[PDB]
Amino acid sequence: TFILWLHGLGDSGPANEPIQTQFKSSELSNASWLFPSAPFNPVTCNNGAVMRSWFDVPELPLKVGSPIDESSVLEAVKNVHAIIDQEIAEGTNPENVFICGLSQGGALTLASVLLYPKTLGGGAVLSGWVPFTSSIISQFPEEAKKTPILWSHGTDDRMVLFEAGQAALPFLKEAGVTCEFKAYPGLGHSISNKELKYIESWIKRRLK
């Protein structure tokens, strides 16, 4: 099993590696985790300040109708796909690949899974958003639409509004993708351990 975790805006891979220690089950004990780090890019919502960032974010908070940026998301998708391609080329079954991420990394998770040519084990989005318009749906590969999505979002999030997460559901229905949406009442823009345990249980169920 291969689990790729994509950090949020400004953060890094090594800062998030301890997330794996919350996945304490026997079933996930042998998983191969990878926590890459985004390049240093200028970020528009931070007035052009440079920080680790998967793709440019024009505005906060993320909302229904907030501006986004497709060429930037696709540069990031290209790199995620290179990682997935190499893992599969080294012999991992595509259905044993899981992509997960927080916020900006959750948006990237979604884009990466939906554009990948093969069905993967799953995409787990934490407090993310849909980082493109419906114009891209025609480009989602046939097998990508079979990859299950688990979307986790805090109801009290004021950085990526809960409504931006709810908006993924009709988008994914249009796209022919199956998504479980898991709301966390009272949670804001952060990860809770219970949220991670539920993701772990979902991975276990997918593995079967």
Residue numbers in the entry: 4 to 211
List passages from the publication reporting this PDB structure:
Both proteins fold into a canonical α/β hydrolase architecture and superpose with a root-mean-square deviation (RMSD) of atomic positions of 1.54 Å over 210 amino acid residues. We found that a loop constituting the hydrophobic tunnel lid is the major component determining substrate turnover rate and substrate specificity.
While the mutant crystallized in the same space group and cell dimensions, we found the loop B-factors significantly increased when compared to wild type AtSOBER1, indicating that its flexibility had improved just by changing the residue that anchors the loop inside the hydrophobic tunnel. While the catalytic efficiency was decreased in AtSOBER1 by substituting the phenylalanine anchor F65 by a leucine residue, the opposite effect was observed upon replacement of L110 by a phenylalanine residue in AtTIPSY1. We hypothesize that a more flexible lid-loop renders the surface created by L63 in AtSOBER1 less rigid and therefore less suitable for deacetylation. For pNP butyrate (C4), valerate (C5), and hexanoate (C6), we measured increased catalytic efficiencies after introducing a weaker anchor (AtSOBER1 F65L) and a decrease in AtTIPSY1 L110F. This suggests that the strength of the hydrophobic anchor determines the flexibility of the lid-loop and that a more flexible loop leads to a significant increase in product release. AtSOBER1 F65L also displayed higher affinities to longer-chain substrates and the lowest affinity to para-nitrophenyl acetate, a pattern opposite to wild type.
